[PDB]
Write a protein that binds this DNA or RNA. Structure first.
Ligand SMILES: [Mg+2]
Ligand SMILES: [Mg+2]
Ligand SMILES: [Mg+2]
Ligand SMILES: [Mg+2]
Ligand SMILES: [Mg+2]
Ligand SMILES: [Mg+2]
Ligand SMILES: [Mg+2]
Ligand SMILES: [Mg+2]
Ligand SMILES: [Mg+2]
Ligand SMILES: [Mg+2]
Ligand SMILES: [Mg+2]
Ligand SMILES: [Mg+2]
Ligand SMILES: [Mg+2]
Ligand SMILES: [Mg+2]
Ligand SMILES: [Mg+2]
Ligand SMILES: [Mg+2]
Ligand SMILES: [Mg+2]
Ligand SMILES: [Mg+2]
Ligand SMILES: [Mg+2]
Ligand SMILES: [Mg+2]
Ligand SMILES: [Mg+2]
Ligand SMILES: [Mg+2]
Ligand SMILES: [Mg+2]
Ligand SMILES: [Mg+2]
Ligand SMILES: [Mg+2]
Ligand SMILES: [Mg+2]
Ligand SMILES: [Mg+2]
Ligand SMILES: [Mg+2]
Ligand SMILES: [Mg+2]
Ligand SMILES: [Mg+2]
Ligand SMILES: [Mg+2]
Ligand SMILES: [Mg+2]
Ligand SMILES: [Mg+2]
Ligand SMILES: [Mg+2]
Ligand SMILES: [Mg+2]
Ligand SMILES: [Mg+2]
Ligand SMILES: [Mg+2]
Ligand SMILES: [Mg+2]
Ligand SMILES: [Mg+2]
Ligand SMILES: [Mg+2]
Ligand SMILES: [Mg+2]
Ligand SMILES: [Mg+2]
Ligand SMILES: [Mg+2]
Ligand SMILES: [Mg+2]
Ligand SMILES: [Mg+2]
Ligand SMILES: [Mg+2]
Ligand SMILES: [Mg+2]
Ligand SMILES: [Mg+2]
Ligand SMILES: [Mg+2]
Ligand SMILES: [Mg+2]
Ligand SMILES: [Mg+2]
Ligand SMILES: [Mg+2]
Ligand SMILES: [Mg+2]
Ligand SMILES: [Mg+2]
Ligand SMILES: [Mg+2]
Ligand SMILES: [Mg+2]
Ligand SMILES: [Mg+2]
Ligand SMILES: [Mg+2]
Ligand SMILES: [Mg+2]
Ligand SMILES: [Mg+2]
Ligand SMILES: [Mg+2]
Ligand SMILES: [Mg+2]
Ligand SMILES: [Mg+2]
Lengths: 112, 122, 116, 213, 54
RNA sequence: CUCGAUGUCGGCUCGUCGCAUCCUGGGGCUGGAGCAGGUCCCAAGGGUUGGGCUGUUCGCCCAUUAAAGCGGCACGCGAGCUGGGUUUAGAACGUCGUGAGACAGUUCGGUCUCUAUCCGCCGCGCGCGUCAGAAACUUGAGGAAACCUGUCCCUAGUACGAGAGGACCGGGACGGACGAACCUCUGGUGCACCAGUUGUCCCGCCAGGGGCACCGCUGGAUAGCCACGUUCGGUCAGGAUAACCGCUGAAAGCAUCUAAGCGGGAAACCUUCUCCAAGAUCAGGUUUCUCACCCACUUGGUGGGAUAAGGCCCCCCGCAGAACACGGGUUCAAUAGGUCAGACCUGGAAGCUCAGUAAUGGGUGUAGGGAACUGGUGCUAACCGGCCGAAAACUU
RNA sequence: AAAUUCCUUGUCGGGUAAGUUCCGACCUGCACGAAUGGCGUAACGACUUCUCAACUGUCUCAACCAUAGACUCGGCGAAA
RNA sequence: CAGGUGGUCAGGUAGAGCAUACCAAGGCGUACGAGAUAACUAUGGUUAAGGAACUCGGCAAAAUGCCCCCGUAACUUCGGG
């Protein structure tokens, strides 16, 4: 328990899956382009959780056109429509920062 | 974040491969350059036979940055390299097409032409 | 435990692991140790966490004590005599009483002892 | 015409608003207060109102301070401060014994939060005042963090008063102006105040209404 | 730096009279039928036979 | 003036002041259409960038900017730092001298000593004073800090103008730089946290661990401290004015801003906002509490003793802290520790079992280990207690 | 235009976004020159000078941690 | 008294080694201590983004590092580099 758990409690969300660092995740992000409100898919490998409840973030890393991108959303953020797990991963660390220096075949995560 | 003497890979086909920052335009003694900030730069490396040559003073807008950017909703974007697009003085790219992804901070800095030529705006 | 806010006992911090382990071997062998007052305030949340492994008393709790204490004869009395002595007490297994300061450097002294 | 409340900083969390932007807030328990005294110009020369805050055991309060509450008919609280008003209009909306809870502020009101900054101890001049210091190499001998010069030469043969030197930093009354109230919560007696508030988590905080807005 | 001049009699005595021992406060303890005086921080050790009264 | 020593140029760090104003602010005249300008007058509140070359100062150049001001203070500042130049001894080139040597001619090399006594400054205590002893909240005499500014849109392609061009005044949005507080996020740090791993010794050996090798190395890391992070500030409105524009109006039947009298008027000045502040010796105000005894003497506004209200010391500690101080707590107690449960960090313990020739892999199991943040729990230490501390009157 | 060039940051080319230093020439050598040697030269240099890759707290711009002092307590106890 | 002093003997595991690391036999803990998260100085450590923009000058620090195997320029006194 924490002292401020009666303030974070109405802002929490359900329907967020149980994904671990090492999984492969679609993130659907609401994007305003003028006044259009479309919905953009971000598919990548979750490398990080930094917990705390309402203050918890996760970090996905894709390789876009020969250039790697990382996004760091908050969990329980209302600009995320839904999260869908594509592939579970078999890792040994909790932060997976060693993928920031790998490309190609060597930046592969196993399939359990 | 980019300041004076930083080197940036070049994300279009003007002929330049590597430019070096000189100022960060936007005010007196402005120190850093995020996404959507205009750089006066010199051209340090080029492709042989291209349009621009070594030692030309250009303007350029930063489109990729290794340092994170706090977007106004709590999310961040981070790239593996520093990239820029050499631009005309009416905020249009000098080359014909843009390589690699760019940031969505270019939308509110009225860079509509770089968005339409980029492969993926994030 | 709560680490030292400030400079460590006996100089380095590799030296404080050795001081607090040697005082525990002596506190569990004799039952009453006279030492300086800062080295006994620092023993009290360090010795009372070794007795808690003796109240549980499995193999995993005995291997955990052998990480810190190197003396097997005092590990035996911890898991056969001291540990089952405190089976109905909820912490606070030690006690610090203050002695007269010693001559020569005016170092304030105290005894640390088990409760009974 | 200037509302105020005493309270306790409880820490910082984050919350989102309707435009899906993140808002870093500082949770303040603007707890229940009680008046205990009204300052009038015909008696005191100024116009203010006292405010009592905090639950204390009645044995921890000594006999001079206790009888100041017995004249007001109020059980003794821990803290006791004043809210400075203007030259009129105090005893028209405050009475001795009134209960000022947290919903005197609305949502989207701007407030001034004053408090007591965290202690930083005896601090040097590269921390207390932002001096640049000397270099870290190129021959510099033992002056890496030292101030440098402190005066002129034989005119003037002194150091001017107010010359920024080392010393103790912090524990000062610090008022932060024009902070935005995000959500008042009368169920819990909690104001969500946008931004940062001076103090450690547990310290006393006076939340007044802003005038600059 | 060196001292410029010698300090007078009035200025050396004003400082030197502040190097003074701060006394402790004694409380009364009766152990083994004899009354003694220890400071209050050694009150428990007087009652357990750990203070040597000489 | 200094030879029984007053350390020299530049740069770094830290400043303070002047105005002969570079920017921003207010104006008169213009050979001021408009936009930009020129010139003079008022104005020192803040701001006045980063690089290349040179020992440089100065200066040229590059890219910006609202602008890249000029000066004093031992050409401010070496018991604060630098030592590249000048200005010791080595050596060389050119030139001069028969030579020894010499050269505001050049060139490479070349020790920067001091534990702060005094005033001064920055902080923090002890003492007494404030006509009894105390506690709480206070008024503000007088001070400190802060003071910068851009781009785009609308008004408007309007006024102005042959066109090209292109506004005043008002309204709005978004920034640069700088200061403050802060730790939710992002990021840094992590010497009693978790995991992998090399060398070696040891725990009798196996299995499991430890000591030491920069914390041995490596991958992470909560709290604290932090900035690269977050939020916020320099506002609005009055007063008295500078240059300058006036109104009414004489001396001087006219005219004149002035002699009588009254206005408008600037980032300067004073209030307003932030902070300190009754040692403001004119030592303030509103309150509540105790509001009381005894002895000695040369009977004195006299010495001691013992108390009340209340405080201090000791004790348990703190995100308060150099020591002191300040803050919380002391059994009618959750103040620190232990302990129990969460949170969070690490990422799947040991033992047993199964699969493999084995290295290793799966299962029991979001396992085990663990510190700071949160809540219950009266188990250990906050005790069986010492030291201070309350009144002549009198005049109107 | 030099370990020699005062005038001098000579002029011209190269390098740099920008080069009083550097490399290339020019010859108006204040004051070059052939054993007080002239002009070159592979290797070699804790020598002087300039450029570049790689790298970094050198810097923009600083932050945190451990230890030895500084600070507190007890002993001894100087100096200009 | 952190300086100076000639020869002799010289173990284990890792290692090319009398380097270095941890150990044997054998010595020693060496002569003020005890505490405490101040500034500041020393001696070390790590550092986002940038990478000489610092500076008289890359001074200091950082970096490169070992064995086996491919491969290796101008220039040269034919050896080298
Ligand atoms: Mg987690
Ligand atoms: Mg610590
Ligand atoms: Mg010590
Ligand atoms: Mg070690
Ligand atoms: Mg502190
Ligand atoms: Mg520095
Ligand atoms: Mg020195
Ligand atoms: Mg140094
Ligand atoms: Mg001086
Ligand atoms: Mg003299
Ligand atoms: Mg004009
Ligand atoms: Mg003037
Ligand atoms: Mg000025
Ligand atoms: Mg002013
Ligand atoms: Mg000046
Ligand atoms: Mg000067
Ligand atoms: Mg000078
Ligand atoms: Mg100097
Ligand atoms: Mg000579
Ligand atoms: Mg001759
Ligand atoms: Mg020289
Ligand atoms: Mg030396
Ligand atoms: Mg000194
Ligand atoms: Mg005043
Ligand atoms: Mg005064
Ligand atoms: Mg600050
Ligand atoms: Mg936190
Ligand atoms: Mg973080
Ligand atoms: Mg451990
Ligand atoms: Mg083994
Ligand atoms: Mg050993
Ligand atoms: Mg943290
Ligand atoms: Mg005004
Ligand atoms: Mg005040
Ligand atoms: Mg008073
Ligand atoms: Mg206290
Ligand atoms: Mg397993
Ligand atoms: Mg088998
Ligand atoms: Mg197994
Ligand atoms: Mg736990
Ligand atoms: Mg030349
Ligand atoms: Mg040449
Ligand atoms: Mg001849
Ligand atoms: Mg000859
Ligand atoms: Mg020769
Ligand atoms: Mg040699
Ligand atoms: Mg001493
Ligand atoms: Mg010796
Ligand atoms: Mg050997
Ligand atoms: Mg050796
Ligand atoms: Mg050894
Ligand atoms: Mg010795
Ligand atoms: Mg320290
Ligand atoms: Mg770094
Ligand atoms: Mg990095
Ligand atoms: Mg680089
Ligand atoms: Mg370089
Ligand atoms: Mg430079
Ligand atoms: Mg500097
Ligand atoms: Mg420079
Ligand atoms: Mg070096
Ligand atoms: Mg090194
Ligand atoms: Mg070579």
């Amino acid at each position: 328990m924490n002292r401020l758990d009666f303030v974070d409690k109405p802002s929490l969300r359900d329907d967020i899956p149980a994904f671990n660092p090492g999984d492969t995740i679609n993130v659907h992000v609401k994007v305003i382009e003028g006044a259009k409100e479309r919905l953009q898919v971000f598919k990548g490998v979750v490398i990080r959780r930094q917990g705390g409840g309402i203050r918890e973030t996760f970090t996905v890393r894709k390789e876009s056109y020969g250039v790697g991108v990382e996004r760091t959303f908050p969990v329980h953020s209302p600009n995320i429509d839904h999260i869908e797990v594509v592939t579970r991963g078999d890792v040994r660390r909790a932060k997976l920062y060693y993928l920031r220096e790998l490309r190609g075949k060597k930046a592969k995560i196993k399939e359990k | 974040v980019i300041q004076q003497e930083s080197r940036l890979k070049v994300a279009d086909n003007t002929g330049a491969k590597e430019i070096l920052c000189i100022r960060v335009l936007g005010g007196s003694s402005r120190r850093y350059a995020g996404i959507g900030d205009v750089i006066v730069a010199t051209v340090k490396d080029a492709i042989p036979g291209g349009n621009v040559k070594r030692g030309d003073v250009v303007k350029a807008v930063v489109v990729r940055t290794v340092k994170e950017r706090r977007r106004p909703d709590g999310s961040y974007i981070k790239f593996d390299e520093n990239a820029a697009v050499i631009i005309k003085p009416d905020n249009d790219p000098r080359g014909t097409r843009i390589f690699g992804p760019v940031g969505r901070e270019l939308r509110e800095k009225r860079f509509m032409k770089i968005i339409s030529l980029a492969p993926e705006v994030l | 435990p709560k680490p030292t806010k400030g400079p460590r006992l006996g100089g380095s911090s590799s030296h404080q692991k050795a001081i607090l382990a040697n005082l525990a071997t002596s506190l569990f062998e004799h039952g009453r140790i006279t030492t300086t007052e800062p080295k006994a305030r620092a023993l009290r949340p360090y010795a009372e966490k070794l007795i808690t492994h003796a109240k549980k008393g499995a193999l995993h709790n005995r291997r955990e004590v052998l990480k810190k204490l190197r003396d097997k004869d005092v590990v035996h009395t911890l898991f056969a005599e001291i540990g089952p002595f405190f089976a109905d007490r909820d912490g606070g297994y030690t006690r610090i009483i203050k002695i007269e300061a010693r001559k020569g450097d005016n170092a304030p002294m105290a005894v640390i002892e088990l409760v009974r | 015409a200037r509302k105020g409340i005493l309270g306790t900083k409880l820490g910082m969390t984050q919350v989102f608003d309707e435009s899906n932007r993140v808002v870093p807030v500082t949770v303040v328990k603007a707890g229940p207060n009680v008046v205990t005294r009204i300052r009038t110009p015909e008696r005191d020369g100024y116009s203010a109102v006292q405010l009592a805050y905090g639950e204390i055991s009645p044995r921890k309060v000594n006999k001079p301070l206790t009888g100041q509450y017995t004249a007001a008919g109020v059980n003794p609280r821990r803290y006791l401060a004043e809210l400075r008003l203007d030259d009129s209009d105090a005893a028209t909306e405050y009475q001795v014994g009134q209960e000022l809870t947290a919903e005197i502020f609305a949502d989207g009101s701007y407030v001034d939060v004053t408090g007591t900054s965290k202690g930083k101890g005896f601090a040097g001049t590269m921390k207390r005042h932002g001096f640049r210091g000397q270099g870290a190499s190129h021959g510099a001998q033992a002056v890496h963090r030292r101030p440098g010069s402190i005066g002129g030469c034989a005119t003037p043969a002194r150091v001017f008063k107010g010359t920024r030197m080392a010393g103790r930093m912090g524990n000062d009354r610090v008022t932060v102006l024009n902070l935005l109230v995000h959500k008042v919560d009368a169920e819990n007696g909690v104001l969500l105040i946008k931004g940062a508030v001076p103090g450690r988590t547990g310290g006393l905080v006076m939340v007044r209404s802003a005038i600059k807005r | 730096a060196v001292p410029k001049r010698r300090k007078s009699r009035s200025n050396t005595r004003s400082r030197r009279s502040q190097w003074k021992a701060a006394k402790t406060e004694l409380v009364g303890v009766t152990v083994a039928g004899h009354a003694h005086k220890v400071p209050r921080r050694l009150l428990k050790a007087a009652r357990l036979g750990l203070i040597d009264f000489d």
